[PDB]
């Protein structure tokens, strides 16, 4: 398709990453006391925050 835009970043990166975080958080609520899912939440949170910052130019 066309080049990437702010709307593009939000709808194809920021929004889908948020879906991944919610899905992982849901996994955490099932089972259990695992270190893996927790780490995924942190990694994904950092990713969106970094992309959210870039999309704000600063």
């Amino acid at each position: 398709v066309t080049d990437a835009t702010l709307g593009s970043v939000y709808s194809e990166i920021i929004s889908p990453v948020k879906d991944c975080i919610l899905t992982v958080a849901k996994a955490v609520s099932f089972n259990p006391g695992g270190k893996d899912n927790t780490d995924a939440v942190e990694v994904l949170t950092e990713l969106n925050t970094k992309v959210e910052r870039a999309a704000l130019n600063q």
């Binding site: 835009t5 194809e12 990694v43």
Partner: protein, 49 residues
């Protein structure tokens, strides 16, 4: 809309997350990591257009 500086900072963020995340720790986490890869690949296709 996006500048070379922004594209170049968002791509690394994605690759860094794909690289350092616990995507091999379980079947569930692998699916999440794959989605991240599809998100990264989708972005490349755009900035490559």
């Amino acid at each position: 809309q996006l500048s070379d500086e922004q594209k170049e900072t968002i791509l690394k963020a994605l690759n860094d997350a794909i690289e350092k995340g616990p995507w091999d720790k379980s079947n569930f986490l692998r699916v999440i990591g794959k989605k991240l890869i599809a998100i990264r690949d989708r972005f490349l296709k755009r900035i490559g257009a």
